[PDB]
Design a protein around this ligand. Structure first.
Ligand SMILES: *Cc1c(COP(=O)(O)O)cnc(C)c1O
Ligand SMILES: *Cc1c(COP(=O)(O)O)cnc(C)c1O
Ligand code: NA
Lengths: 385, 387
């Protein structure tokens, strides 16, 4: 439950029962034969795991620095890493005898991931979404609806994510009997930060085995973008003990850190409690959840997972920020150079790995976690016009 | 070069040289050690091959018929099987010392797959596209530009695909020195129909091995949509000699065959000569390429590859049609039932297999080639269906 002084279970009495049932279920099942047999079956024949580790030769050479490898999570069914975590908890909820999935979503990306899983396993799916976001993400709402999920707008409060989260919790408290609260990142009250990370670690395991086959050695630096921090942890974890492996997390710099328009919790947030956990969040002078801005929809969460705040404390991992302008430039660069259109989120890690690579030696290895494809960001990019 | 009486090189004198050079180049590199090592390298680390073979348990049961398997070409990089051919030809062009890639495109899907492969191999890419189609595929045109490809609108003639094809041949005649003409389907003058199919057959091979591992036996019926016919030929080929395997190609029925508003060259076209080949095409009473209609963008090609006309003839394969309405229904079905949003093209194959399944025993296997994903079709479906 604790990663140093970050984490916990800051939740009402009402939520203690479900959370213990969940943590219990996860314990037994965590390594149960079948559950894993089933999970690996869907992950394989449905999600298309494992994803390849691609060496961006053209890009590296154009920079004349370290070797830049892309862990292709953009190729998993759905286009994003979120699918890993979604199949996991959905399958777990199935094993728990649950028949309904609920979740909140800012950009709508996690909502889609949940809807996909729900649909796959024949479970009812209700997605809470701040009316503000719903009117901003017409396509993801449409996408979730095509998959058979129900989108429940939230007009209470500021009609945003925090409001969706509250509504989601509300629903779970009363329906947890047959309803599972599918959290989308390594956040929320225990055991969520741990469960999500375990479900994403598979990224790191493959990426490890793959880099050993392609280079016969572990990488020098691993770079991933950080919103809640799930794709970062998923690929970070397997290398936490390999001391020589540097870990770099990239947060959204937005219009610039000094402009207040960003979503860099770790670099500009303060410690506090939100979503049932103790970690870094972006508040206002009154302890209220403050805005988030990033050309990247998925880097909207007003905070970051506890394990990341921890890793930052013990200095096992370094956390930087990249601006919208930089990410947007990286987006165009990969597309033109490697014929790969990355998600705007991923473009943040790419942007930084690029700077980093330039200041390194030809045979130093950098593994960038390409968390997703950018088909979904074409409209917003079409900014460039 | 000939599949029965279909195929050939019905082209101008100026094109016989580049074509012979290409065929020569393909002959040697076809099985060269290096070439293939690089091809398999890119197909794996960049395109993510192999794609899995998924069992739509929920769908099969909901129909209570044969087992419905899905060859997931929707998971390949780019979201469509077109990438397999784009890589293969781009790579071949590289080995030939070409530095430029040209291509025509109707919906812009082949345009996108060529742009990606060009970007991957540092080649210059110019895409010819009828102005008509350019103005109707805003997102793909943008996609191609993002990939660093130059989109050349064509306003001559009817401003459509046939006009785009004429400009592409034109260009190739003058620039074949350093420019490779990358055809997107099993169509065109020899050796194209053969090269494209070879680059797509990897789909069938994988699917063959994968079904044997999942069912220990070959499938009863293989179903794939058919535009030009490349994803159908890619998954069919490996099973041609397996006489017990049923082969069904599905064409665009559009508004309904009798309406004439479709794109079913095999089921309603006539033998003809176009794009340098003798095969089935949709032509008006004046031997002119007729407009096609389909809710699925990629089934717009006004004809079909010669090898499919041949397979139809000798009856090795059966070809049916599915309407926009039916494909659209499968689109929604697959999405809610398996959590897989198929391409409208593939929705045609899915729609038919579904019908075919219901009239089969539960021990019978059907393999549908899910040629692509539906992210690219959300806009049209939003308008057409609503919600
Ligand atoms: C949601 C998303 C993110 C950010 O979330 P994390 O939990 O921090 O990984 C990053 N990349 C993509 C492609 C996403 O969809
Ligand atoms: C272009 C396309 C087709 C049709 O072309 P074929 O050459 O007949 O395969 C089918 N499915 C998808 C997903 C396509 O993009
Ligand atoms: Na056709």
């Amino acid at each position: 439950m604790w990663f140093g002084e970050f984490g916990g279970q800051y939740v009402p009495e009402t939520l203690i029962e479900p959370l213990k049932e969940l943590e219990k279920a996860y314990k037994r099942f965590k390594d149960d034969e079948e559950f894993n047999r089933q999970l690996n079956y869907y992950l394989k024949t449905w999600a298309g795991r494992p994803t390849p580790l691609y060496y961006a030769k053209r890009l590296t050479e154009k920079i004349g620095g370290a070797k830049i490898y892309l862990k292709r999570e953009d190729l998993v069914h759905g286009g994003a890493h979120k699918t890993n975590n979604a199949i996991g908890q959905a399958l777990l909820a199935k094993f728990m005898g649950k028949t309904r999935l609920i979740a909140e979503t800012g950009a709508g990306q996690h909502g889609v991931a949940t809807a996909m899983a729900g649909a796959l396993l024949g479970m009812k799916v209700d997605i809470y979404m701040g009316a503000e976001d719903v009117e901003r993400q017409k396509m993801n709402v449409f996408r979730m609806k095509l998959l058979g999920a129900n989108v429940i707008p939230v007009n209470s409060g500021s009609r945003t994510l925090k409001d969706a989260i509250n509504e989601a919790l509300r629903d779970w408290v009363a329906t947890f009997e047959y309803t599972h609260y599918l959290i989308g990142s390594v956040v929320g009250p225990h055991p969520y930060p741990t469960i999500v990370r375990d479900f994403q670690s598979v990224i790191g395991r493959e990426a490890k085995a793959q880099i050993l086959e392609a280079e016969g050695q572990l990488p020098d630096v691993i770079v991933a973008c950080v919103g809640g921090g799930s794709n970062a942890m998923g690929i970070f974890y397997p290398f936490v003990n390999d001391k020589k492996v540097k870990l770099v997390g990239v947060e959204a710099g937005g219009k610039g850190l000094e402009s207040g328009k960003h979503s860099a919790s770790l670099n500009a947030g303060q410690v506090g409690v939100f979503h049932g956990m103790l970690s870094y969040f972006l508040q206002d002078e009154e302890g209220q959840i403050k805005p988030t801005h990033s050309i990247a929809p998925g880097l909207d969460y007003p905070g970051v997972g506890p394990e990341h705040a921890y890793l930052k404390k013990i200095q096992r991992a370094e956390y930087v920020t990249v601006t919208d302008e930089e990410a947007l430039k990286a987006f165009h660069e990969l597309s033109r150079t490697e014929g790969i259109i990355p998600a705007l989120e991923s473009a943040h890690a790419v942007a930084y790995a690029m700077k980093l690579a330039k200041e390194m030696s030809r045979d130093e290895i950098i593994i960038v976690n390409l968390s997703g494809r950018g088909d979904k960001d074409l409209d917003i990019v079409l900014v460039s016009g």
